Write a protein that binds this ligand. Structure first.
Ligand SMILES: NC(=O)N[C@@H](CC(=O)O)C(=O)O
Ligand SMILES: [Zn+2]
Ligand SMILES: [Zn+2]
Ligand SMILES: [Zn+2]
Ligand SMILES: [Zn+2]
Length: 362
């Protein structure tokens, strides 16, 4: 007895093309998405070249249209000197990403004044998302208030962060957030097994109290998003390990296991992987699109999942209950039981669909 789910949406993935294609490309990363029950992804802009102007966006659009197997939208990235220059292309992007802390990015902003300049110049009806850890969450919320608009907080990982967001929502402030599976299912207790290279991620893995606080405050979490951040094992275990975990192929199995245990409901999962992504990012429906899952099948996560070029996973050894059996995307069988059945290039840029433009006042 399979359960039919709508097409799930991951609003935070790194597909590494252009410029990091040994780690992942559009074709391999979207294969990983489909195998994880994800039919639409929003790809981050910290590529090489980074997606920080109209020419880079045009390149990335063509690479994605040629390589993606599922549908997508592409983020633009903020830089210290590109505020006020993105207006002609802003509506074609998923949103604008701000990198406000140290991480795997060359995009960090130098001054809160540059955050203000972006919030003032980026069109007010279009999404802004931020990598903002600890007190940076409070700082970016202040900038959003000064400029009288909303903000979405990426990968919330700490008790401190979720309680600050909770307090802001209680005051009626327009803030949303997402949580990644590693911050729900891994902690400091896993660092001995992972070791110091594999364990590198931003935000870093939290304490048991951080993990417990995210679960206790599920009502505050608007979305789940993988922050799929593939790097090869050689890179993770070398002299200067980059932070990040692959996650597309493991996210839905981990969350289905939690549903089976009664830790959240099926509806709670679908709000966070379908309805709230749609409404926060103004992403369009996908016609004739659904995911069939088997909630009974028990399995153990192996040392690498089949599709991601990262070829490793921090969830190795965890026992899960739930698997993706079939995905149909826009009327075509896209995935069955380990086989991807749509070619590179089947996926489309949802921002080019009439229904994928963000409504605005004239
Ligand atoms: N989270 C990470 O540790 N790494 C991400 C970047 C990010 O989401 O900050 C990556 O692109 O590798
Ligand atoms: Zn980040
Ligand atoms: Zn994000
Ligand atoms: Zn990221
Ligand atoms: Zn529904």
């Amino acid at each position: 007895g399979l359960v039919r789910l709508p097409g799930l949406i991951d609003v935070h993935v790194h597909l590494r093309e252009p410029g990091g294609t040994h780690k992942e490309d559009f074709a391999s990363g979207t294969a990983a998405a489909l195998a994880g029950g994800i039919t639409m992804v929003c790809a981050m802009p910290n590529t090489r070249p980074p997606i920080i102007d109209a020419p880079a966006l045009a390149l990335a659009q063509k690479l994605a249209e040629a390589g993606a197997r599922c549908d997508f939208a592409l983020f633009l990235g903020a830089l210290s000197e590109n505020a006020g220059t993105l207006g002609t292309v802003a509506g074609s992007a998923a949103g604008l990403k701000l990198y406000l802390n140290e991480t795997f990015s060359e995009l960090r902003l130098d001054s809160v004044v540059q955050w203000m300049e972006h919030f003032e110049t980026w069109p007010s009806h279009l999404p802004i998302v931020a990598h903002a850890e600890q007190q940076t969450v409070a700082a970016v919320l202040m900038v959003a208030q000064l400029t009288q608009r909303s903000v979405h907080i990426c990968h919330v990982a700490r008790k401190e962060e979720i309680l600050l967001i909770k307090a802001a929502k209680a005051r009626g402030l327009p803030v949303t957030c997402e949580v990644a599976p590693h911050h729900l299912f891994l902690s400091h207790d896993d660092l001995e097994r992972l070791g110091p290279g594999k364990g590198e991620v931003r935000p870093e893995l939290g304490s048991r109290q951080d993990v417990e606080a995210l679960w206790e405050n599920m009502a505050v979490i608007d979305c789940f998003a993988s922050d799929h951040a593939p790097h090869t094992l050689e890179e993770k275990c070398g002299s200067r390990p980059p932070p990040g975990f692959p996650g597309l192929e493991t996210m839905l199995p981990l969350l289905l296991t939690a549903v089976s245990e009664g830790r959240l409901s099926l509806d709670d999962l679908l709000q966070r992987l379908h309805h709230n992504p749609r409404r926060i990012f103004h992403l369009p429906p996908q016609e004739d699109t659904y995911v069939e899952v088997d909630l009974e099948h028990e399995w153990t996560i192996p040392s690498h999942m089949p599709f991601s070029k990262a070829h490793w996973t921090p969830f190795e050894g965890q026992k899960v209950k739930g698997t993706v059996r079939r995905v149909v995307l826009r009327g075509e069988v896209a995935y069955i039981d380990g086989q991807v059945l749509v070619p590179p290039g089947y996926g489309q840029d949802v921002r080019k669909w009439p229904q994928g433009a963000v409504p605005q006042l004239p």
